[PDB]
Write a protein that binds this ligand. Structure first.
Ligand code: CAA
Ligand code: CAA
Lengths: 395, 396
């Protein structure tokens, strides 16, 4: 059965001074208007946890405070935690609910407020997320830093190639007014920015933000009959997942730890497509090593060569009068976690929303020509611990 | 499309174990693998539920990492799901889905907690914080269920003593299970005389805090037969269904459509192509008496609003049978349930499953139903009637 994303809604991004409940409720209202639906048309809701306001049975808490109950007929609610892979994991769960006929329509919601919560509270709760890892604080950046160092030793990845990631992302961010990064970085600025971990500087770190996104998923026929273009409500062609350890081993690490390749392969197989058929990529980029690993995993370049992929794109940007042409780097045209923003487990949602914009020819000055017919989105959780990949097609 | 079975069960003891949640989870999983005649490397997925005693970001991943499941040779899918006490059965349905879509041929489902060892102060704090914005007085969860019980008394004429009969019946079952935390059956007077917790809920009517963990291994029948290989000891998961309701009750009393167990039960029966008369064992979530009263109505063991009378007739028959509760006349929670077996937060719907397996395989001992049940229904509930999960297990 053909399943589509039929509604998208979201809040702004940044320091919003709103509760997580308020942000979630706003995003969902927006998504329902976008889908030409009302609350009573929803048959399920899936959410992911919040760091700023952790709640027991988060999805149920959101649904209750947002006034979805009482309901006429069946309503299935669930919370899932696969870290930043969560929004795409949930998307796959939504497809499953529709295909098994447990729910004809499904809301998927992610919301957080990790900028408004304050630096002290964020540091405490984000570091506590990695107890027993043995990682120095801040733990998540140090975890990714250890994998980056392994890459440099194993594959010859260069320090400057890591720093090129936020440069490229910032060039994309410039063409998105909502992106938190306003002015593109130079390579020198990134390398001169405050050190956070041995090979990770401040400008290479995911940008704390508040924000929420809601998606509505429905069977194609069901939607056509009741609620009444292809690219603006894309088909979810496939979703696949894979996993790895929550944190790295004390002693350096093996290639089979990385799970994105497995997820990507299975998503391509399920969709009956190859990398050459995909013309937009929304790839999780919490740190440069994540994006470098991602481009390899999805088949944009050979294993161990992701750093060189960045350098060629950087060099071409420099030779093109400092302009990063989207057609030569069809990745994260919104700016990613680096430069658009990162509300904890939310931002894989922005890969989906940017893919939809590209597919529907509504991406503006970021728009790819010709219009992409197919897109791939990738969510990552933990420290390369969860991989979720989906392929979206217009028709 | 494809037949999926529970091929391995493992669990720890129950009570005050003074072990970490990680340690309990790892032990349960090792036990389940031995029970399935499998090794770690034969697992292709792991689903877990959160712990109150040791909350962890990406709980399932944390457990899998500390337990040494990585590095792995092939694909391995890990996820944590939260539907409260409905979680173990929710996860069971997700495991079936992973097998049928061919994402994973084998799936471990794990629940672990240590809410007795964590201490009363910490438990009260974290359990009450679980219901922020509810407006419920402390302890919040008991008061939430208490409000629904009071509504039942006003709406359907449920009597106070009929609530108190639930733990009496459960304690009679618990007596015949050596692992159950309750070892001496209660009298009705003892329950009614016990310390008040909420307006119509006393201490002996409350879910019994405990530590414990359970692990299940789920696999396609053919896959399992080829590589690792009775029907009742490794039962078919015939169907799983879910439904939901608000996390906490409205300020002003409440409507019948709030309750979701009936919907979940109906859909599970439809998926399995069975009726209530085909089921001869019921493992029904019973965190408080009102939960069990609602459950027996929802699954079709008695009419709506009459669950209290169902308890009273069983109680009266027990009294007229020399104080002996005959399992064949009350084929429900033969282990003692959350009331009298024990309740490690989101774990105890696992014990409905393990008791169903024991009954189906004729390994339930002095609790054993005769004739041997061929089919069982298990029910998990989360929040305050907020999540319903129902599964039907059959031997063949
Ligand atoms: C969840 C999953 O499963 C997977 C994942 O997403 S992994 C990624 C999760 N997210 C993170 O790890 C967050 C990374 N960031 C951090 O840990 C911290 O922000 C940090 C260690 C980098 C800095 O912490 P800090 O010392 O408290 O500085 P912080 O208060 O954050 O920011 C200070 C300033 O730098 C700026 N800044 C911070 N990060 C920036 C970035 N990436 N780019 C540009 N500017 C930045 C801010 O604008 C801020 O300005 P003001 O002082 O004027 O407000
Ligand atoms: C999570 C979901 O999604 C759905 C659900 O499961 S909802 C149910 C979740 N679980 C609960 O709500 C737990 C219910 N229990 C409680 O809230 C509390 O234990 C309580 C309010 C009943 C009592 O708290 P308290 O005043 O601190 O007493 P507590 O420390 O628990 O124990 C009191 C004593 O009586 C005994 N006792 C406690 N509960 C008992 C019970 N249900 N039956 C028999 N004996 C009990 C204990 O052995 C203890 O003995 P000592 O103090 O002499 O060692």
């Amino acid at each position: 059965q053909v399943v589509r994303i039929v509604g998208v809604g979201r809040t702004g991004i940044g320091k919003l001074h709103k509760s997580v409940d308020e942000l979630a409720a706003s995003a969902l209202k927006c998504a329902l208007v976008d889908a030409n639906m009302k609350q009573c048309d929803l048959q399920a809701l899936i959410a992911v946890p919040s760091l700023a306001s952790p709640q027991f049975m988060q999805a149920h808490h959101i649904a209750t405070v947002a006034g979805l109950f009482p309901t006429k007929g069946k309503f299935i609610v669930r919370t899932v935690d696969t870290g930043g892979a969560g929004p795409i994991t949930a998307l796959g769960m939504a497809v499953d609910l529709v295909r098994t006929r447990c729910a004809e329509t499904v809301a998927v919601i992610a919301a957080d407020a990790v900028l408004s919560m304050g630096s002290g509270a964020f540091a405490e709760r984000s570091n506590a997320s990695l107890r027993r890892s043995g990682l120095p604080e801040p733990c998540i950046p140090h975890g990714y830093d250890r994998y980056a160092q392994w890459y440099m030793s194993r594959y010859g990845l260069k320090r400057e190639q890591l720093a090129m990631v936020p440069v490229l992302m910032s060039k994309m961010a410039e063409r998105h007014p909502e992106a938190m990064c306003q002015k593109a970085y130079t390579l020198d600025e990134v390398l001169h920015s405050r050190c956070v971990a041995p090979v990770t500087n401040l400008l290479e770190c995911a940008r704390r933000a508040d924000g929420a996104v809601a998606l509505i998923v429905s069977g194609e026929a069901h939607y056509a009959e009741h609620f009444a273009l292809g690219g603006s409500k894309p088909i979810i062609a496939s979703v696949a997942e894979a996993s790895g350890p929550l944190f790295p081993p004390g002693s350096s690490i093996v290639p089979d730890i990385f799970s994105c390749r497995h997820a990507a392969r299975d998503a391509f197989l399920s969709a009956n497509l190859n990398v050459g058929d995909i013309h937009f990529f929304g790839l999780y980029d919490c740190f440069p090593i994540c994006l470098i690993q991602a481009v390899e995993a999805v088949g944009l370049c050979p294993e161990g060569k992701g750093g060189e992929f960045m350098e060629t794109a950087y060099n071409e940007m420099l030779n093109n009068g400092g302009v990063l042409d989207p057609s030569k780097f069809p990745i994260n045209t919104h700016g990613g976690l680096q430069c658009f923003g990162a509300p904890w487990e939310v931002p894989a949602m922005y890969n989906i929303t940017e893919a939809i914009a590209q597919l529907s020819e509504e991406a503006g000055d970021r728009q790819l020509t010709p219009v992409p017919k197919r897109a791939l989105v990738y969510g990552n959780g933990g420290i390369f611990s969860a991989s979720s990949v989906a392929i979206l097609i217009s028709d």
